[PDB]
Amino acid sequence: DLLKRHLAPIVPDAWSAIDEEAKEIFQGHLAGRKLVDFRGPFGWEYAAVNTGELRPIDDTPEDVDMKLRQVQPLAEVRVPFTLDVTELDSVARGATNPDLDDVARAAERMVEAEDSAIFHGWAQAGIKGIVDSTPHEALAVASVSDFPRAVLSAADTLRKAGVTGPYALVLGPKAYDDLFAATQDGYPVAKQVQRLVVDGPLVRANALAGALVMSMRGGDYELTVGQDLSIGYAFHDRSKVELFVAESFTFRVLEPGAAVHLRYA
Amino acid sequence: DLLKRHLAPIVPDAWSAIDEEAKEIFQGHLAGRKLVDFRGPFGWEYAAVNTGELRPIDDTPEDVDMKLRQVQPLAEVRVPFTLDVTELDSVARGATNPDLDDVARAAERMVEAEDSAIFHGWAQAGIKGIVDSTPHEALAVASVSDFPRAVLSAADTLRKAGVTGPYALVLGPKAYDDLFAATQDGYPVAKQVQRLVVDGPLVRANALAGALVMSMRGGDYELTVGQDLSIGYAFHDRSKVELFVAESFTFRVLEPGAAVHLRYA
Amino acid sequence: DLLKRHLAPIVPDAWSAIDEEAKEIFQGHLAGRKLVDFRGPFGWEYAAVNTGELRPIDDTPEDVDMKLRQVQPLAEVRVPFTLDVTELDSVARGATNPDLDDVARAAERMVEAEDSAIFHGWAQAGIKGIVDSTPHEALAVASVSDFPRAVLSAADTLRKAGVTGPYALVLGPKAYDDLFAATQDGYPVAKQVQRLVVDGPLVRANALAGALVMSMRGGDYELTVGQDLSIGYAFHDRSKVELFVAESFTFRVLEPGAAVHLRYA
């Protein structure tokens, strides 16, 4: 009831239309949720992730030893958007293409925020992502044909760093497009690369600079979601209605050495 | 009974022969019906598609607000053709190849009309097609080998425009022939292109200029058919019998930004 | 749910009071709905009436014949009004005469709009009424005593025009008052007139200029109502609440020669 959706001047079918418009973008753009570990939605009142460490408190007496637990507080993010009440009424009159452009804009903005956090961190929320926290040095992939061998090198790094398990290749939009549009003497590079990596389709990540190789053994990267992506009502005028996309989440790099960055090719 | 078929001097087997000749062409040339949404045949008395919008009426008093509903009236199209009564009698005498050339000519003319409407519109009937109404700028495919990368670019456009879902590639006759006859260093381009798009066979569209990429998520383009393609009787002489192919249809572009044109390669 | 009534700061009993105030006026002033054919309320998404005709499209090729279906799009009309929240609260405190004057004003305004459309048309909505579309010439009724004979003449016209069936006499307010207040040598004219027409009570129409005679055989005039007369909520202040009366309707003159106008007496 924190979304206050029943207070909106919106017919149920328009609610379904907005939800479908957002959900299609979320399932078609959330690369992070498909490749890291995901701790299920815990609700609104889930506040922080228990990391398990302890911090030694200075200036304590000798007869007592005092330590402070360490936690990772979640970040709650809301992106507002606005819709026309007449457009939403249209769907009650049988219309099937109401103007839901701002719904898509806000949904992609939220996807951008969460994925940029997952990959390249978020200093304000105290989140370090996969790329900004790996200790290895990023491989250089001079050309698209360099992708197979470089990928193998990455895997070697992960085996020499102790990180076993099948390794997935994640591609930024430029990298994904160039790899899948490339042929080596007619033979497509993507076929060889897919032979060298996990059997699943290669993940295209919009918010990833260059490319990445990461272990999928599990337990390396954990995304905690308190309140999953939701659409809620804020206010409304005679003609304009204000909604928001809301999510409470945090991201933890359990094993920083479980992924290797690859500069763009 | 609007086709008045029982009034024709045609034996039932000749009716079946004409129907088969038309139906084979319809299933082998109707590309539009296989790639857009199709609202089922509603019958003869289905007049218009309810778009759901409202139009503000000018010059109205202050104490009243008046709006006019908006609809898309269907177009009813008949193409006549003529057959020899003796040729149609032949099939009652065991003949299996009666001269049904005009049946094929009329059937392909109707296919041409409907597909040209679907792709490039029809101003007289107030129909805008997929190509004439997309807002993006058509990609340039200089050569057949340019097809993969260009296709990827198209998909990128659709993802940046919010149009998710699997993307199908539709080919004009020239484009289809050149793509499927082409090899890059021996490797066929069509294999790579088919790897880059939906798993179904690529659709060849005779009435398409260049090529097209379009989302198949559904809800983007809607073809409404009131009366499906039918053969009806008009008049007959001592030797000549006049029939027609009849169809009542309209086509709506729900989301103009759901498809990208590609100039021919 | 297009009326959004559950969002209003109005107790259920005040809703019932407003509905009763409107419904009494609607049943006591809607003359059109009692004398024309009425196609039932089809809902909000019913857009247009299928007239059944076809229009020949110019500039079409010879091998194809193209015709456009003809429809009559409905008109959606909303008249706003405003009520005091304190007055509506009074009914929760046992009050039985809350100030619902604006409810009556809006209800009579809507009755005026619909009946004026039915009788004298509405150019903006593309509606022709009964009076403006009859082909005969309006009879002249010099005095109230002229009513019987003139009425008979009207019936004669309808029989000579082929329009059979019992004929009803509809009276404008001036005509109704003058006829029912008139006596010929003590004998009331209304008795003779009622003997000459259908057994039902003569209909008083507020929005009718002069009088009218019309066949009640059925199939002559058709009123289509998509959304029937309803009261809906628009907005509200701390003290003021805005509602509206809403209706989607259109009116069709199937047989223009089925009624005769009579100039006022």
Residue numbers in the entry:
A (entry chain A), B (entry chain A), C (entry chain A): 2 to 266
Task: Copy out sentences from the published article reporting this entry, exactly as the authors wrote them.
The reconstruction displays a T = 1 icosahedral arrangement of 60 encapsulin monomers, with clearly resolved secondary structure elements. Small pores are visible in the shell at, or close to, the two-, three-, and fivefold symmetry axes, where protein monomers interact with each other. Regions of the reconstruction around the icosahedral fivefold axes displayed a lower resolution than the other regions of the structure in a local resolution map. With the imposition of I1 symmetry on the reconstruction, the EncFtn cargo is not visible within the lumen. This suggests that the organization of the EncFtn protein within the encapsulin shell does not conform to icosahedral symmetry and is rotationally averaged through our symmetry-imposed processing.
Encapsulins are protein nanocompartments that house various cargo enzymes, including a family of decameric ferritin-like proteins. Cargo enzymes are directed inside the encapsulin nanocompartment by a terminal localization sequence (LS) that binds to the interior face of the encapsulin. EncFtn oxidizes iron in a similar manner to other ferritins, but due to its open structure, it must be associated with an encapsulin nanocage to act as an iron store. Together, the encapsulin EncFtn (Enc:EncFtn) complex can perform both the oxidation and storage functions of classical ferritins. Here, we investigate the structure of the Enc:EncFtn nanocompartment from the halophilic bacterium Haliangium ochraceum to gain a better understanding of the arrangement and stoichiometry of the complex.
